[PDB]
Design a binder for this molecule. Structure first.
Ligand SMILES: CC[N+](C)(C)c1cccc(O)c1
Ligand SMILES: CC[N+](C)(C)c1cccc(O)c1
Lengths: 527, 527
């Protein structure tokens, strides 16, 4: 049967799922590793020991333990990212969508979810890969990885809590995908890994890490990149933060071993409850447990790896959303309210800039303000609001990203850059947040095709355009079959991704990113 | 007779000069001090000992020794500022234009010429006050002061070369004007001193210096202010520079006395020939001998005097020209040519920024470039040219000026601000220099009235508008009799001075001046 697949790990019994007016095969909850429960907590992922009999892949697996967003109870706009399944340390599973009839050797797409590394689930409705698989005839895989302390606690030097295990979970699923995707009709030599924000940053990290380059062909980075200010921390900082977490749970802090045994004995929720109290600054767009520059997964500093072309050379497709910042301001910046226009005063604005650049000194904060302030209307509430959004966005997502493309393109084999600036008609978030972080996902996953979701006609088109772009690029290394220009260091071409007839632009936010990528860094170094 | 005037200094025989289709009285070359020749060189100005018999004031006096501009031989646009008379250390004279019939007690206007303190003459044709006097029925006085080493050499602590003597020459003429203007029909209690660039900066210095406040009523500052980066130097710098000048002439440098005797024995031209070799940096818009913050003429630092309201409180009328920088770039910046479009490359642009901010460090130079560069078209020759012009202008004239108005208005009694941005139709300078430094003078002195000068009809109007504004403000402390708004710290209103129907704007170049007045200063201090 089309639902019974044999794999090097065991037999898998999938399920037939309905798509639009047809069907596809669905293999959900396939284990790719040993449950990271018990003294395995914080440990590197273990390979799933093969099984006997058919594994039932007809229902989504559990979700990884993680901070749940209770900020707006019942508000779909926020709950849609919350885990829709029971949480559990036993969460290392992957899901595959397979076209019906099963392909003999088609292109594979692996999705790596986002969540600032502290959250994420492969089972969210927005990550339902049935539409992409059906529409673009691609084998769509969605993996899961330990998030929060569970996946990134880093007691560097220890083997019980090495750090980056969440990064290893991803890799192992990539390995599982490499090793068994042929049995699902997928071509293991044409596997494209794509992700958003933390997933988008993860992708580039696999591009960078030597132990991961050989396991995938092409990559798609959405609103995230390896060098994002919040995507990593030094071994020391990770240590610092690991200890602090221990401190918060009344743990013996005399040795890694005492510390780690302690943390291993505390309930998942116990680590989560105090997870944000370890950050080093009052700040926004900063997450507690993230990848560490350990010298293992990452041979060295990301910048030198970038600088010396020490990374897998291939084709990459990446982009950013118009308003990357809003989301984070509405959640931790004063003056912002989900239900108000959020006109921001200068006192509040200047507070926002302090939360945005936590590492900046007074001069740095002053340089940022000078640059993002209209001194001819410095008391405008709208201009201050928007100014804050651009700051959170440029510094955390768009500028870090432009640095990575510019550096990548130098040695890479084809760069394609998009700028998503279309606000879904049915968006439930206040208008002032604009084209919000993570709201390109639904277009990439072809949600606009399901009419009972009420998208506009041109949004359906947009979704098919992006889905094709995404699927066609994965298949060939080029989004084109009206041509989306190749990104080059000289011309710096890039395009818009909206319901209007695509347009080609140059030098994405140069002014602001020169400041963020070259000037500020220098200033703060000098001072 | 209307030409014979008795004064507390002696009888003066003037001359009748023709204006438009009528006449006026002219008293030119009246001595206000003892010739600063001999061992008097560098010494403070001495009062003119009274004379017997009638003094012949029918021909302009000599001009003060000074660097002559030979950059464009025969080019009127530059020679028009050159001395049109024989130069001589015997140059402390003043000129008065008196309406015919002589007024009984009318408003007096004293003009203090510009020239970056190294040049200037009261006898230039552009400074011919017959038009203003006739048209506005005002007693127009034009003084002269020692310029260059002769007027500003500063061996602070010495009495032979105290420094600022050029500033004292001005004062003494002001005193002479105070003491004898009544005999010419001028009201000594309604004397307005106005000047351009160095004269405009001089004016504000007399506003500041305690020993000068009582000698005038109102002030008009054109394209210059006391705190201009080039208007003053510390006693040390002046000393440093005085010695260096001595070094250049093979002078005993063992004592002020040996040094000064040496300099006193060298010919005027000898000091001039080496006058520019003492500057401390490769730079533009920097002059060798300028006022020194000596603690005598200036009680203390200009900023604290500004900060504590330690200055004469009255009404002031000041402004700037659209393109203050061009002139200085065309003369010392690479890439600029009087006869070319002057499209500037980035290599040349970056050289310009180095010459513009000589005291800036690498970070400072980088902050300036970031701010004045269009990184979306950083290779534009026109944009680089213009960018350089704005830099030389904002930092040397417009921003220093905005700081002085903002500080002044705080304790002042009426501020009126103009922005001259009209390029005379008959301008002989290349179009790219735009509305050039010092080209408002001719409008203020009503040159556009003499048809054989070929101005347009609306330029004639402009000139009468400004002349009235200038004369009406001096008479009443208000330019208005369509109303030129009063400058206030809150609103920051100011107007345009061009052939088009005046318009009111706010916050003159805020963006750029916040950077220049607040950010940069801080940056360079921090680093
Ligand atoms: C904005 C919603 N989404 C789940 C994508 C999310 C949440 C936290 C951090 C992120 O970078 C992104
Ligand atoms: C630009 C011509 N003018 C004589 C007014 C002049 C010359 C030198 C320095 C100045 O600030 C102004």
């Amino acid at each position: 049967s089309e639902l019974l697949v044999n794999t090097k790990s065991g037999k898998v019994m999938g399920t037939r799922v309905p798509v639009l007016s047809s069907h596809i095969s669905a293999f959900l909850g396939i284990p790719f590793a040993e449950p990271p429960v018990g003294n395995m907590r914080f440990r590197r992922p273990e390979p799933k020991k093969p099984w006997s009999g058919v594994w039932n892949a007809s229902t989504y697996p559990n979700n990884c333990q993680q901070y749940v967003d209770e900020q707006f109870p019942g508000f779909s706009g926020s709950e849609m990212w919350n885990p829709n399944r029971e949480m559990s340390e036993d969460c290392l599973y992957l899901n595959i969508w397979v076209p019906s009839p099963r392909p003999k050797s088609t292109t594979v797409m692996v999705w790596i979810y986002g969540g600032g590394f502290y959250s994420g689930s492969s089972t969210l409705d927005v990550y339902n890969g049935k539409y992409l698989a059906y529409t673009e005839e691609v084998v769509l895989v969605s993996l899961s990885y330990r998030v929060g302390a569970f996946g990134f606690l880093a007691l560097h030097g220890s083997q019980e809590a090495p750090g980056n295990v969440g990064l290893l979970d991803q890799r192992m699923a990539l390995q599982w995908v490499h090793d068994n995707i042929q049995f699902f009709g997928g071509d293991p030599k044409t596997v494209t890994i794509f992700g958003e924000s933390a997933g988008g940053a993860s992708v580039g990290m696999h591009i960078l890490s030597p132990g991961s380059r050989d396991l995938f062909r092409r990559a798609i980075l959405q609103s995230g990149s390896p060098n994002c200010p919040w995507a990593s921390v030094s071994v020391a900082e990770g240590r610092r933060r690991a200890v602090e977490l221990g401190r918060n749970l009344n743990c013996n802090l005399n040795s890694d071993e005492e510390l780690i045994h302690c943390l291993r004995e505390k309930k998942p929720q116990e680590l989560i409850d105090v997870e944000w109290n370890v950050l080093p600054f009052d700040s926004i767009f900063r997450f507690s447990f993230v990848p560490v520059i350990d010298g293992e997964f990452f041979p060295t500093s990301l910048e030198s790896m970038l600088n010396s072309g020490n990374f897998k050379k291939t084709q990459i497709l990446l982009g950013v959303n118009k308003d990357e910042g809003s989301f984070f301001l509405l959640y931790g910046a004063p003056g912002f309210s989900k239900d108000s226009e959020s006109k921001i005063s200068r006192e509040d604005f200047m507070s926002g800039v302090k939360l945005s650049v936590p590492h900046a000194n007074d001069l740095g904060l002053d340089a940022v303000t000078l640059q993002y302030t209209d001194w001819m209307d410095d008391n405008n509430g709208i201009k201050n609001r928007d100014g804050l959004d651009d700051i959170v966005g440029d510094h955390n997502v768009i500028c870090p990203l432009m640095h990575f493309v510019n550096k990548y393109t130098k040695f890479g084999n084809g760069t394609y850059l998009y700028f998503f600036n279309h606000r879904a008609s049915n968006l439930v978030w206040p208008e002032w947040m604009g084209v919000i972080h993570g709201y390109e996902i639904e277009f990439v996953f072809g949600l606009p095709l399901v009419k009972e979701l009420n998208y506009t006609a041109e949004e359906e088109a947009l979704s098919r355009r992006i889905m094709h772009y995404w699927a066609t690029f994965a298949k060939t290394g080029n989004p084109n079959e009206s041509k989306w220009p190749l990104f080059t260091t000289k011309e710096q071409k890039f395009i818009d991704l909206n319901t209007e007839p695509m347009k080609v632009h140059q030098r994405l936010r140069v002014q602001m990113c020169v400041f963020w990528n070259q000037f500020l860094p220098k200033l703060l170094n000098a001072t």
